Each structure stands twice: as structure tokens, then as C-alpha cells.
Design a protein around this ligand. Structure first.
Ligand SMILES: [Mn+2]
Ligand SMILES: [Mn+2]
Ligand SMILES: [Zn+2]
Ligand SMILES: [Zn+2]
Ligand SMILES: [Zn+2]
Ligand SMILES: [Zn+2]
Lengths: 162, 162
DNA sequence: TTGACTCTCTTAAGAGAGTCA
DNA sequence: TTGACTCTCTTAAGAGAGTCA
């Protein structure tokens, strides 16, 4: 099995490579009518992506390193968390984008949590709008707001009470 | 079926049958430390479910009627909305449980909205905790809260900024 | 050892359609 | 005509593994 030193070396090589990705400045809602700035380190749209990186789906990538003649591969956003527990409350841990930018691989924009926790950030009011996430959101979720409901609760007769 | 009269007859038959489902009272968090009461009309756990109803999945049902000698079938929660547009902004409209209770078929607990709007209600703080849904939530979402994040944003080197 | 592709799978909110009696 | 089963599909947040040179 890979040693602690070996895993740290994988994380360090990943950081070195991702740090050279194009850095894009994005202005983002924080909640409470305030605006902030995030700096995303974005993987390229097409090959080549960077040393060790390859695309396995339209918005999915993997990182690969060969150690002692054994090929090791990980989801592209999971590498910062290789020394952390991989489950919690019986649920698999997932890489969660605090910046809501899939191509971004900035580890300061990622957290490690259940898929349910991950998804819910899409609707969070944000760090200046009432976020209660213990690991705080960096921005208001892109789907926060009144919504676009087409039809609300209703009945034609009198068979029901709320 | 095709006619408005036929569609109204389908909604009326569905309401009459669902109106005879057992009414189960559920006390629910509203947000803001307050509690409310919902009355769900719950489809039975096993056959028979009611005239026109059949189970197509562990928590999925369909409603079926014969009109002009042809069988017409719909997802069991979609019937109240048969006169509404079936899409919004190019996204499919879905039946969305304001009570977060799949077996419930009370139309006073359903709305018709995109899958994203639907999902997002799971994390809403609720009608007394800050819900901003234009079609208001009936309760705080079951997944609202601080989460259980295992690891937050972090780097080993000095290549990244927020 | 490495790059650039290929394929299918998970989850939890939701769907459509066919086989028998 | 009605009932009680069977199967796979959609979405958008996420995954693992194979092939070839
Ligand atoms: Mn996410
Ligand atoms: Mn729902
Ligand atoms: Zn980012
Ligand atoms: Zn948050
Ligand atoms: Zn209900
Ligand atoms: Zn709400």
C-alpha cells in the first residue's frame, strides 16, 4: 500500500500541476446583496490538460500516477483529501465545489462531504445571506431564490385539508 | 385524454379516490423553532392501492383510466397538473412534495416545478425560518442544517488563493 | 510510465412503458 | 376493463475501471 509519504508526494505533485492551470477571476454573489471575488484554477477544455490528468467524461477527469510499477488513479478533485476519512454517517465522501465551477481544481474551493451536503450548497443563501454550513460556503448557491414554480397546491373539490 | 372535459373528469376521479386514502397527521419543523401540522393522504403500502392506481417502483405509482376504449396512464402525482404546461424554461415540470412524504397524494401538498426547484426544497429553512420560494414551503426541508463535512478547503503548499 | 480516449456506475429527487391475469 | 406486477429511463451533483501505443 502507498505510504503516508507517498500519498503526500501525490498531493504535492497534483498541487504543483493544478497551480499552473489558468487562474480565472470571477465576481460572485455572497448573499445579503454583497458581491465577492473567487479565483478558480480551471482545467483546460481539451487535451492536453496537464501532467497526470485525463478526461473520463464531459465534466469528469482523473489523476494518475505510477509508483513502484503500479498504476494508481483517483477522481481529479479527490486528491486533496487522500489523507482524510472516505465516509461519514454511513455515507461516501465526495469532493464538493464551494465555487460551483466543475472545471476548477483549486483545493481552497473544495470540501469533502456527503453527496446530500454537496448538492444542498446549490440553494444556500451564502456566507453573507444566512449560510449555516459548519464548513462555510464561499458564495451564494447558483439556484438560490424564489424559483419558477408553474403551479402551486390546489384542489377542484373539497376532499382535502392541508 | 384529449378533451378538457375528459381531463377534468380524470382529475375529479383521482381526487375522489385519493380523498379516501388514510389521513395521517405529521408534525413538522417550520423553521424558527416553530412546529406545524400537515395532514397527508397516504397511498397504502401494498395492493390494493385504490381504483386506478398501481405501483411501478418501491416509491413510484401510476394512475390509469380507459377513455374512448384506450388506456391513458400518468405518474400518480402528476394528475392535478394535467392542464398546466409540462415544461418551464426548457426544463421538464415535475410533481414536487411540499410535505417531503412520497406516499402522500394530497394535492394541497404538491406543486409543479422544475426538478432543480423540487430538489432544492430539501434544504429550505422553511416558512418560519426564511423560505423565499414564491410558492411557499409547508415545512423546513429535512436536510436543512450545518451538514457533516469531513474536511474543508486546504492546501499543503503556497500555490493557491481563494 | 504516460496520454487520450473508451465504457459503465451512484444517489435521491423525479419519470415512461410492457407482461400477465 | 381493471389490477398487480415487471423492466428501464432522467437529471445534475458526484464516481471506478479498460484499451492501446
Ligand atoms: Mn457541488
Ligand atoms: Mn421533492
Ligand atoms: Zn473555483
Ligand atoms: Zn452554505
Ligand atoms: Zn403530504
Ligand atoms: Zn422554501
Amino acid at each position: 500500500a502507498l505510504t503516508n509519504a507517498q500519498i503526500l508526494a501525490v498531493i504535492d505533485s497534483w498541487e504543483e500541476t493544478v497551480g499552473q492551470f489558468p487562474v480565472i477571476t470571477h465576481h460572485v454573489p455572497l448573499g445579503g446583496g454583497l458581491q465577492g471575488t473567487l479565483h478558480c484554477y480551471e482545467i483546460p477544455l481539451a487535451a492536453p490538460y496537464g501532467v497526470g490528468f485525463a478526461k473520463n467524461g464531459p465534466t469528469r477527469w482523473q489523476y494518475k500516477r505510477t509508483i513502484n510499477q503500479v498504476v494508481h488513479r483517483w477522481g481529479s478533485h479527490t486528491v486533496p483529501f487522500l489523507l482524510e476519512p472516505d465516509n461519514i454517517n454511513g455515507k461516501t465522501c465526495t469532493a464538493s465545489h464551494l465555487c460551483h465551477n466543475t472545471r476548477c481544481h483549486n483545493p481552497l474551493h473544495l470540501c469533502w462531504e456527503s453527496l446530500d451536503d454537496n448538492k444542498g450548497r446549490n440553494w444556500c443563501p451564502g456566507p453573507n445571506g444566512g449560510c449555516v454550513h459548519a464548513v462555510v460556503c464561499l458564495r451564494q448557491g447558483p439556484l438560490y431564490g424564489p424559483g419558477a414554480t408553474v403551479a402551486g397546491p390546489q384542489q377542484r373539490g373539497s376532499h382535502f385539508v392541508v
